Design an enzyme around this catalytic site. Structure first.
Site, PDB file in Angstrom:
ATOM      1  N   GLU A 102      14.004  -0.852  22.433  1.00  0.00           N
ATOM      2  CA  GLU A 102      13.866  -1.995  21.426  1.00  0.00           C
ATOM      3  C   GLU A 102      14.818  -2.670  20.661  1.00  0.00           C
ATOM      4  OE1 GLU A 102       9.521  -2.445  19.664  1.00  0.00           O
ATOM      5  OE2 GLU A 102      10.479  -3.342  18.392  1.00  0.00           O
ATOM      6  N   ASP A 153      -2.669  -9.370  16.269  1.00  0.00           N
ATOM      7  CA  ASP A 153      -3.428  -8.744  17.069  1.00  0.00           C
ATOM      8  C   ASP A 153      -4.193  -8.818  18.206  1.00  0.00           C
ATOM      9  OD1 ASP A 153      -2.083  -6.277  16.377  1.00  0.00           O
ATOM     10  OD2 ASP A 153      -3.495  -5.580  15.070  1.00  0.00           O
ATOM     11  N   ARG A 159      -0.022   9.836   3.979  1.00  0.00           N
ATOM     12  CA  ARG A 159      -1.512  10.504   3.881  1.00  0.00           C
ATOM     13  C   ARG A 159      -2.121  12.012   3.012  1.00  0.00           C
ATOM     14  NH1 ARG A 159      -2.405   8.749  10.387  1.00  0.00           N
ATOM     15  NH2 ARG A 159      -2.353   6.526   9.782  1.00  0.00           N
ATOM     16  N   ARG A 210       0.672  -1.107   0.056  1.00  0.00           N
ATOM     17  CA  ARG A 210      -0.084   0.092  -0.176  1.00  0.00           C
ATOM     18  C   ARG A 210       0.861   0.806  -0.466  1.00  0.00           C
ATOM     19  NH1 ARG A 210      -3.770   2.468  -0.068  1.00  0.00           N
ATOM     20  NH2 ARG A 210      -4.239   4.091   1.281  1.00  0.00           N
ATOM     21  N   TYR A 224       1.129 -14.085  13.441  1.00  0.00           N
ATOM     22  CA  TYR A 224       0.881 -12.891  14.217  1.00  0.00           C
ATOM     23  C   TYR A 224      -0.369 -12.709  14.370  1.00  0.00           C
ATOM     24  CZ  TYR A 224       1.018  -8.644  16.146  1.00  0.00           C
ATOM     25  OH  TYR A 224       0.984  -7.697  17.093  1.00  0.00           O
ATOM     26  N   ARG A 271      12.853   1.927  18.376  1.00  0.00           N
ATOM     27  CA  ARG A 271      12.346   3.123  19.152  1.00  0.00           C
ATOM     28  C   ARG A 271      12.890   2.867  19.906  1.00  0.00           C
ATOM     29  NH1 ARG A 271       7.363   0.203  16.756  1.00  0.00           N
ATOM     30  NH2 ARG A 271       7.045  -1.869  17.691  1.00  0.00           N
ATOM     31  N   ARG A 309      11.176 -14.567  14.491  1.00  0.00           N
ATOM     32  CA  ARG A 309      11.761 -13.242  14.654  1.00  0.00           C
ATOM     33  C   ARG A 309      11.166 -12.920  16.984  1.00  0.00           C
ATOM     34  NH1 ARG A 309       9.304  -7.329  12.330  1.00  0.00           N
ATOM     35  NH2 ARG A 309      10.174  -5.720  13.996  1.00  0.00           N
TER      36      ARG A 309
HETATM   37  C1  FDA Z   1       5.899  -6.858  20.386  1.00  0.00           C
HETATM   38  C2  FDA Z   1       4.475  -6.885  19.863  1.00  0.00           C
HETATM   39  C3  FDA Z   1       3.220  -5.663  20.513  1.00  0.00           C
HETATM   40  C4  FDA Z   1       1.447  -6.473  20.387  1.00  0.00           C
HETATM   41  C5  FDA Z   1       1.739  -7.920  20.112  1.00  0.00           C
HETATM   42  C6  FDA Z   1       2.975  -8.902  19.744  1.00  0.00           C
HETATM   43  C7  FDA Z   1       3.596  -8.021  19.725  1.00  0.00           C
HETATM   44  C8  FDA Z   1       4.826  -9.405  19.690  1.00  0.00           C
HETATM   45  N1  FDA Z   1       0.515  -7.922  20.036  1.00  0.00           N
HETATM   46  C9  FDA Z   1      -0.724  -9.010  20.784  1.00  0.00           C
HETATM   47  C10 FDA Z   1       0.578  -9.764  21.893  1.00  0.00           C
HETATM   48  O1  FDA Z   1       1.526 -10.304  21.457  1.00  0.00           O
HETATM   49  C11 FDA Z   1      -1.133 -11.514  20.964  1.00  0.00           C
HETATM   50  O2  FDA Z   1      -2.442 -10.401  20.614  1.00  0.00           O
HETATM   51  C12 FDA Z   1      -1.323 -12.304  21.811  1.00  0.00           C
HETATM   52  O3  FDA Z   1      -0.066 -12.496  22.866  1.00  0.00           O
HETATM   53  C13 FDA Z   1      -2.029 -13.693  21.557  1.00  0.00           C
HETATM   54  O4  FDA Z   1      -2.818 -13.963  22.373  1.00  0.00           O
HETATM   55  P1  FDA Z   1      -2.578 -15.740  22.643  1.00  0.00           P
HETATM   56  O5  FDA Z   1      -3.017 -16.412  23.522  1.00  0.00           O
HETATM   57  O6  FDA Z   1      -2.994 -16.129  21.411  1.00  0.00           O
HETATM   58  O7  FDA Z   1      -0.844 -15.836  23.119  1.00  0.00           O
HETATM   59  P2  FDA Z   1      -0.442 -15.578  23.688  1.00  0.00           P
HETATM   60  O8  FDA Z   1       1.716 -15.738  23.349  1.00  0.00           O
HETATM   61  O9  FDA Z   1      -0.413 -13.957  25.017  1.00  0.00           O
HETATM   62  O10 FDA Z   1      -0.314 -16.572  25.602  1.00  0.00           O
HETATM   63  C14 FDA Z   1       0.339 -18.109  25.315  1.00  0.00           C
HETATM   64  C15 FDA Z   1       1.091 -18.387  27.337  1.00  0.00           C
HETATM   65  O11 FDA Z   1       0.567 -19.744  26.600  1.00  0.00           O
HETATM   66  C16 FDA Z   1       2.609 -20.452  27.731  1.00  0.00           C
HETATM   67  N2  FDA Z   1       2.067 -21.706  27.462  1.00  0.00           N
HETATM   68  C17 FDA Z   1       3.265 -22.009  26.779  1.00  0.00           C
HETATM   69  N3  FDA Z   1       3.782 -22.999  26.070  1.00  0.00           N
HETATM   70  C18 FDA Z   1       2.470 -23.756  27.350  1.00  0.00           C
HETATM   71  C19 FDA Z   1       3.121 -24.818  27.977  1.00  0.00           C
HETATM   72  N4  FDA Z   1       3.914 -25.853  27.516  1.00  0.00           N
HETATM   73  N5  FDA Z   1       1.870 -25.405  29.118  1.00  0.00           N
HETATM   74  C20 FDA Z   1       1.353 -23.916  29.581  1.00  0.00           C
HETATM   75  N6  FDA Z   1       1.373 -23.037  29.038  1.00  0.00           N
HETATM   76  C21 FDA Z   1       2.594 -22.964  27.882  1.00  0.00           C
HETATM   77  C22 FDA Z   1       2.992 -19.285  27.963  1.00  0.00           C
HETATM   78  O12 FDA Z   1       3.922 -19.063  29.172  1.00  0.00           O
HETATM   79  C23 FDA Z   1       1.404 -18.095  27.344  1.00  0.00           C
HETATM   80  O13 FDA Z   1       1.172 -17.110  28.737  1.00  0.00           O
HETATM   81  C24 FDA Z   1      -0.791  -6.499  20.208  1.00  0.00           C
HETATM   82  N7  FDA Z   1      -1.418  -6.672  19.155  1.00  0.00           N
HETATM   83  C25 FDA Z   1      -3.078  -5.469  19.644  1.00  0.00           C
HETATM   84  O14 FDA Z   1      -3.610  -6.145  18.773  1.00  0.00           O
HETATM   85  N8  FDA Z   1      -2.425  -4.697  19.521  1.00  0.00           N
HETATM   86  C26 FDA Z   1      -0.572  -4.666  19.861  1.00  0.00           C
HETATM   87  O15 FDA Z   1      -0.434  -3.120  20.630  1.00  0.00           O
HETATM   88  C27 FDA Z   1       0.220  -5.533  20.330  1.00  0.00           C
HETATM   89  N9  FDA Z   1       1.120  -5.293  20.416  1.00  0.00           N
HETATM   90  O1  UPG Z   2       9.538   4.650  11.355  1.00  0.00           O
HETATM   91  C1  UPG Z   2       9.240   3.526  10.402  1.00  0.00           C
HETATM   92  C2  UPG Z   2       7.619   2.610  11.018  1.00  0.00           C
HETATM   93  C3  UPG Z   2       7.753   1.547   9.648  1.00  0.00           C
HETATM   94  N1  UPG Z   2       8.705   1.570   8.691  1.00  0.00           N
HETATM   95  C4  UPG Z   2       8.046   0.462   8.313  1.00  0.00           C
HETATM   96  O2  UPG Z   2       6.580  -0.598   8.170  1.00  0.00           O
HETATM   97  C5  UPG Z   2       6.743  -1.623   8.648  1.00  0.00           C
HETATM   98  C6  UPG Z   2       6.215  -1.489  10.215  1.00  0.00           C
HETATM   99  O3  UPG Z   2       6.525  -1.950  11.567  1.00  0.00           O
HETATM  100  P1  UPG Z   2       6.327  -1.792  13.045  1.00  0.00           P
HETATM  101  O4  UPG Z   2       6.453   0.485  13.157  1.00  0.00           O
HETATM  102  O5  UPG Z   2       8.644  -1.520  13.172  1.00  0.00           O
HETATM  103  O6  UPG Z   2       5.058  -1.801  13.612  1.00  0.00           O
HETATM  104  P2  UPG Z   2       4.139  -1.427  13.673  1.00  0.00           P
HETATM  105  O7  UPG Z   2       3.194  -1.137  12.492  1.00  0.00           O
HETATM  106  O8  UPG Z   2       3.025  -0.280  14.990  1.00  0.00           O
HETATM  107  O9  UPG Z   2       2.930  -3.071  14.368  1.00  0.00           O
HETATM  108  C7  UPG Z   2       3.685  -4.658  13.602  1.00  0.00           C
HETATM  109  O10 UPG Z   2       3.368  -4.547  15.017  1.00  0.00           O
HETATM  110  C8  UPG Z   2       2.179  -4.828  15.955  1.00  0.00           C
HETATM  111  C9  UPG Z   2       2.269  -5.003  17.020  1.00  0.00           C
HETATM  112  O11 UPG Z   2       3.764  -5.685  17.502  1.00  0.00           O
HETATM  113  C10 UPG Z   2       1.313  -5.268  14.845  1.00  0.00           C
HETATM  114  O12 UPG Z   2       0.080  -4.590  15.419  1.00  0.00           O
HETATM  115  C11 UPG Z   2       1.883  -4.944  13.740  1.00  0.00           C
HETATM  116  O13 UPG Z   2       0.284  -5.661  12.879  1.00  0.00           O
HETATM  117  C12 UPG Z   2       2.879  -5.148  13.176  1.00  0.00           C
HETATM  118  O14 UPG Z   2       2.964  -4.363  11.764  1.00  0.00           O
HETATM  119  C13 UPG Z   2       7.850  -1.035   9.398  1.00  0.00           C
HETATM  120  O15 UPG Z   2       8.779  -2.785   9.803  1.00  0.00           O
HETATM  121  C14 UPG Z   2       9.425  -0.725   7.789  1.00  0.00           C
HETATM  122  O16 UPG Z   2       8.975  -1.653   7.085  1.00  0.00           O
HETATM  123  C15 UPG Z   2       9.543   2.402   8.554  1.00  0.00           C
HETATM  124  O17 UPG Z   2      10.010   1.902   7.375  1.00  0.00           O
HETATM  125  N2  UPG Z   2       9.589   3.135   9.781  1.00  0.00           N
END
Ligand code: FDA
Ligand code: UPG
Ligand code: FDA
Ligand code: UPG
Ligand code: NA
Ligand code: NA
Lengths: 386, 386
Positions: B312, B365, B179, B175, B363, B287, B256
């Protein structure tokens, strides 16, 4: 009787008083309005070509931290999640606004941390001590220094009050106008939005009650003696011009006014923000409002290729011109104090109450007026109708 | 029985499935969690010195346009009016973000009207036709041109994926990322906020039910044979690592990861915004999160002179490291497709369902996961418990 209460004006103040009397006391209320529309200056209507809602008496953004008022007005309309934001146009660049880390970065060339920025303002404003200032120009410079003052305040202020800052009281600024973060909500208040189906719809809902009668296109002074004849101890609320009530027997109150230049352009988007301030003197107007952006949640009922915008100008206001802002010269505030005396006399002698923007020579925000009304209702009107 | 349903994991996915089974079917549900805390990666806890809420598994902002999910999660916690916003740090200046009239003005020197800005991007991106691109570097440049690409994307992207853009598929951008207005909400969705008393409080509320039993600090593989013994046709929901279930019998799935560097500083305010992206390669991290700003409505329970922040970093993730983002190499997506086969077999043979972030190598949300759970509940679990 046909009515128990007469309300002159249909601004928020009249309407409120009216509606309370109708719903809480069950009285018969007659609303008399000079214009042809309900609402007073809050009124909004659709531009004909485009369908877009606009405000013929100045743009109106609703915001309050007064929960009482909030719950109240929500009885008559829903609000959007609109948060108001503003940008300041200076030397062909649009600055983040108001003054904060954002603007600061754009102007002085690089990022300043919050702590850095506090210090940056320390040195800048060090020239004059706020305890020194003799006029508006100094008092600002004493608060934020000359570079900023001259760029973002000096011309804007001048345009708005038709004057040089050096010839304005120092008392008109009372606070450091700078934020040491990136938060650019224009407003600090708890609640904020725009009426979902517009103000017209909203205002109108307030008068839609089985006890309220509305006569548009009616001047009170033309029909007063007649109406009070029908039921003489029915009381009146007057929200019209204070001085005019008493036939300017004591000098005309001084108001500031606005002229609005409204154009339709053959583009879907003219500046991509609701409000764009203009701070350089090269431009007549103070800001340009582009109204579609106030209701982006409607942009699928909006013209793909047209947009309405409006330029705002300021000057002093006299006769025939709409009054907007009290000027409050010293020679204004005593001829006021005087009319107060008259009004109170007139309130005890003839059950006529004075309220609202025009009726008290006083700037009022919407929620302010509404509260002011609700005060008067509860404190003066409940006993006045028994 | 003591339980009718076993749920492995207590992330949003487990919790949801759990709570539905408890409140809508009235079943007995046993939740088994490996960590010592409820919540999975969504979990948040207070930094000890300052009291400020932080997220040890990445910052989490909640946002959805899915009303179903919204009404649901509101059953367990209220949200704030938090709107997420981001700034991009490039050459010692903080840019408005994402790409729009704002950033554009700051970078190319002066204000561009919406129409002007569309044109500005036309010429810039004219170099490569999007139909041409061979890798990520081109495909961007083909969409927004080199000046922008190199400033705001090239290094940021590189840091996040440990790689040169030229060696990434062109399919990862889909995309126009620009904006043509001043609106810098980071998110386009209908509903958005943060849990009022934090995530911990929220997550925990979901398990607070008279039919749900939670055993923290318990690995499922250590206690499975035992528990299924107690009631053998009670079904399981497994939200743990997919590959590990099947003892990596088929290759380790590639993830990752992130390393978080969390410091307490002796200042009340370090950058005056929740998130500050860093787009220049001179910096290791992508960031810096400053957590107090996520809950400004608490800043009267916050340290006047201290603030917690967090840097991070990204890299590839292996063993012992927490998995965060599926990598999805080609050699990953078939060893997946394969494990799917295994799971389905295992689902029919032994009533064990697979769901959630880890359980499906995908992945998600938060609202996505929650919905995914609600799907599974209604479509597979209602009949599975009769
Ligand atoms: C860095 C980052 C940031 C975000 C997000 C992801 C990441 C990586 N997500 C939120 C989030 O990571 C995701 O939505 C949830 O973790 C998914 O919930 P789950 O139940 O699927 O997995 P989740 O990983 O949370 O639950 C797994 C659980 O199972 C347990 N477990 C694993 N193996 C086990 C075993 N063998 N026995 C017992 N327990 C065990 C673990 O300990 C853990 O508590 C997100 N989404 C969004 O909408 N907005 C956001 O801003 C973000 N932000
Ligand atoms: O300053 C910036 C921001 C973004 N990007 C590009 O756009 C991507 C977006 O990633 P990032 O800004 O790091 O994260 P978010 O878009 O806010 O979120 C990622 O991670 C979130 C939580 O882990 C999820 O909600 C989203 O779906 C997922 O895209 C990056 O990899 C880059 O390729 C840039 O080049 N520069
Ligand atoms: C440019 C500008 C912009 C804003 C604001 C002010 C201004 C000047 N205000 C909103 C608004 O102007 C103010 O809050 C209300 O107009 C006050 O309502 P009133 O009932 O007091 O007076 P208002 O002036 O609205 O009502 C008076 C009514 O009485 C009628 N009338 C007068 N003389 C009469 C007579 N002789 N006989 C019969 N009828 C007569 C008039 O025709 C009019 O309908 C504001 N506030 C806020 O909270 N947020 C905002 O964003 C704004 N925006
Ligand atoms: O770019 C700017 C903006 C403001 N100012 C100064 O600050 C004042 C603020 O006035 P203005 O920005 O024009 O209007 P608002 O502050 O948004 O609102 C005024 O008018 C509103 C509606 O009419 C009311 O709600 C407010 O109480 C009243 O202050 C100006 O007179 C200037 O002195 C500047 O110097 N430069
Ligand atoms: Na000073
Ligand atoms: Na192109």
């Amino acid at each position: 009787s046909d009515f128990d209460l007469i309300v002159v004006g249909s601004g928020l103040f009249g309407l409120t008083v009216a509606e309370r009397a109708a719903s809480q006391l069950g009285k018969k209320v007659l609303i008399v309005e000079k214009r042809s529309h309900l609402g007073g200056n809050a009124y909004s209507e659709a531009e004909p070509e485009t369908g877009i809602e606009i405000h013929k008496y100045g743009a109106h953004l609703f915001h309050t931290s007064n929960k009482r008022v909030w719950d109240y007005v929500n009885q008559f309309t829903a609000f959007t999640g609109y948060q108001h934001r503003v940008f300041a146009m200076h030397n062909g660049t649009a600055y983040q606004f108001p003054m904060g880390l954002g603007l600061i970065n754009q102007f002085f060339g690089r990022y300043y941390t919050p702590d850095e920025a506090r210090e940056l303002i320390k040195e800048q404003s060090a020239e004059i001590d706020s305890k020194d200032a003799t006029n508006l120009e100094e008092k600002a410079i004493s608060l934020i220094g000359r570079p900023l003052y001259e760029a973002f305040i000096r011309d804007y202020t001048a345009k708005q009050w038709q004057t040089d800052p050096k010839e304005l009281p120092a008392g008109n600024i009372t606070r450091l106008p700078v934020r040491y973060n990136f938060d650019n909500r224009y407003f600090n208040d708890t609640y904020e939005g725009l009426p979902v189906d517009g103000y017209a719809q909203w205002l109108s809902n307030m008068a839609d009650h089985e006890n309220i009668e509305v006569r548009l296109d009616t001047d009170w002074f033309e029909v007063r003696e007649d109406l009070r004849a029908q039921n003489p101890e029915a009381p009146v609320v007057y929200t019209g011009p204070l001085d005019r009530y008493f036939d300017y027997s004591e000098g005309h109150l001084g108001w500031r006014t606005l002229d609005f230049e409204t154009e339709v352009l053959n583009t879907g988007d003219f500046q991509g923000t609701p409000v764009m301030n203009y701070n350089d003197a090269e431009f007549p107007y103070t800001r340009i409002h582009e109204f579609r952006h106030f209701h982006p949640e409607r942009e699928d009922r909006h013209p793909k290729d047209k947009t309405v915008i409006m330029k705002e100008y300021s000057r002093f206001a006299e006769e025939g011109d709409e009054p907007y802002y009290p000027i409050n010269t010293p020679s204004d505030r005593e001829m006021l104090f005087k009319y107060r005396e008259l009004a109170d006399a007139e309130t005890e002698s003839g059950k006529v109450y004075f309220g609202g923007r025009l009726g008290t020579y006083q700037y009022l925000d919407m929620h302010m007026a509404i509260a002011s009304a609700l005060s008067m209702f509860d404190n003066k009107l409940v006993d006045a109708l028994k």
